[PDB]
Nucleic acid binder design. Sequence first.
RNA 1: GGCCGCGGCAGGUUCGAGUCCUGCCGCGAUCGCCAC
Length: 443
Amino acid sequence: MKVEEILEKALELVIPDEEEVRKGREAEEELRRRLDELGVEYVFVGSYARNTWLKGSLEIDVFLLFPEEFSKEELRERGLEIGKAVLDSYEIRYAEHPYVHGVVKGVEVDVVPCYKLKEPKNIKSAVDRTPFHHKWLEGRIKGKENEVRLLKGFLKANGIYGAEYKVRGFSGYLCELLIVFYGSFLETVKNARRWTRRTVIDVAKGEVRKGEEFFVVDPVDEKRNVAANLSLDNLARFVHLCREFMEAPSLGFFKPKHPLEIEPERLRKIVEERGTAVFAVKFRKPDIVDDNLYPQLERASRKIFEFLERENFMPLRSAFKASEEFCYLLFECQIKEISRVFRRMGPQFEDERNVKKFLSRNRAFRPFIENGRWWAFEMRKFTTPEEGVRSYASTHWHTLGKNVGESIREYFEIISGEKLFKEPVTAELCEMMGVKDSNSSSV
RNA sequence: GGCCGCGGCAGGUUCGAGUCCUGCCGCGAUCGCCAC
Ligand SMILES: Nc1ccn([C@@H]2O[C@H](COP(=O)(O)OP(=O)(O)OP(=O)(O)O)[C@@H](O)[C@H]2O)c(=O)n1
Ligand SMILES: [Mg+2]
Ligand SMILES: [Mg+2]
């Protein structure tokens, strides 16, 4: 099995065992000890302070509260200083807002400097609302922490948990606001089935209305969309899963699906049977953080895809992969080869000023009249997608994202055929082409 | 870094470009939006 007997067996997958929780309190206790020793004003926020973190994903967030008068430079220089003095080991790789990731007694800790504000109206940093989220949520989320862990685990199992640009899914804070709104995981799933791309969920007003886009209003700042970085597709993937779940509840919805090793021979036969052109652009991964890389991989991939369209290679889907050393942009086209000749439109037969110009241009195959206007046969410069993409990548490297484009300028290569199936892109290829039985939630 | 705007200014392609492609600059009041 029944709807409820499956949620029982699902709590064993999302709730942290007490051996892990204990490891957390010991780290928390030691963190408060060191922070109180430095006489800095701080506050514990996030999934750990609300006890709604997922099993096997323990991470303690700590926000440092600094005076409003501080410069963005003083905030950084002081934030990093405290972070390093509090953490056993640390690491600094941030995107826009400075912070310090590290470890304390074996658990991961984030130390994020922000401004101590009263009323979160005219925020200074992007992270200034986060302490105010905790104030609003702590009183209302009490009792429903496991209903949050169900929604998080559900989303995590189908790869749409995370607001980061690698995922474009549901932030952890968005999940908590949904449970406060619907009361339970089961009630969120039920009502989610009838969401649309114009649904507006105002938690503060206890109201659902229609809008310009999917919009979950922040109780703390009504102008801010909590689900801003949730893509329309991942919105659809969620709504779809909810309809499937209510139709036939299963525990497998909470089981992480990992890919399968697909033999390069079976993969060669799939592409053969499709009769498509499957190739990829390979270049060095720029040394940048993921929230800078993926929006650019998304851009580079799109810019080339749009190129293939207007060049009439009739592309199907695109995809990308980032290994440790290299990045891959994969494409699938219906046209492996097109003619050298195509027909270009000329002027109408009346205005000879324009016609004589059209006919004056030397061509190899002579122009002709059709439906009252002139046409000419022109030649292409490339007749295959690979030849075309080699041209586009070489000349228009600059528009494929700043860092990606700059990497593509220094070096890229077009991999095709079986030489590609040996690359670390099999999973992306199977997802892209809709290959069946290439995933398994098996433990 | 990516994305959305009102704008323009050149260049490329074309018989023909406000309209397709590329480069550059200005301004977004919720110091335009996202990332924690
Ligand atoms: N897209 C995001 C990311 C985070 N935050 C804020 O940052 C806090 C903590 O950051 P994060 O670790 O990313 O969120 P968690 O709630 O801790 O999610 P998780 O369970 O995965 O740790 C959240 O409470 C939230 O208020 C946010 O508002 N919007
Ligand atoms: Mg966290
Ligand atoms: Mg954090």
